[PDB]
Amino acid sequence: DGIHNDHIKFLLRDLYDGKEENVPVIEYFGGRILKATDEEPDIDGLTASRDANKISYRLSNAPSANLPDVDSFMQL
């Protein structure tokens, strides 16, 4: 603990001005996010739509074989 806190304190004083307010905050400390400058779904077989009520994701019903990841699909 001590060795972690001397680090946050070292780190605060060094890049935050002692200002605890200058420290970003998140919901839960997990993975990082890849911020999109686009934010537009350029994916095959997938169509994307949205109101302020509902975001619609529909995968193609084409017999043909093309679809996004199981990974990409769970990012979105």
Structure class:
alpha+beta
Strand content: 5-15%
For the largest beta sheet, what order do the strands appear in spatially? 1-2
| Count of DSSP H/I helices | 2
Helix content class: 10-25%
From the spread of the alpha carbons, the general shape counts as elongated
Order of helices and strands: HEEH
Count the strands?
Answer: 2
N→C terminal distance: 37 Å
The value of Rg in angstroms is: 21 Å
Major sheet details: 2 strands, antiparallel
PDB class: transferase
Keywords: fungal, dehydratase, enoyl reductase, ketoacyl synthase, ketoacyl reductase, malonyl/palmitoyl transferase, transferase, substrate shuttling, multifunctional enzyme, acyl carrier protein, fatty acid synthesis, acetyl transferase, fatty acid synthase
Entry title: Crystal structure of fatty acid synthase from thermomyces lanuginosus at 3.1 angstrom resolution.
Name: fatty acid synthase beta subunits
Quick gist of this model?
The protein is an alpha+beta fold.
Question: What labels would you give this structure?
Answer:
part of a larger assembly; 1 chains; 76 residues; alpha+beta; 13% strand; elongated; transferase
Structure description:
The protein contains 2 helices and 2 strands; from the N terminus they run αββα. The chain has a two-stranded antiparallel sheet with strand order 1-2. The two termini are 37 Å apart. It has 76 residues and is α+β, with helices and mostly antiparallel strands. It is classed as transferase. Keywords: fungal, dehydratase, enoyl reductase, ketoacyl synthase, ketoacyl reductase, malonyl/palmitoyl transferase, transferase, substrate shuttling, multifunctional enzyme, acyl carrier protein, fatty acid synthesis, acetyl transferase, fatty acid synthase. Crystal structure of fatty acid synthase from thermomyces lanuginosus at 3.1 angstrom resolution. The protein is fatty acid synthase beta subunits.
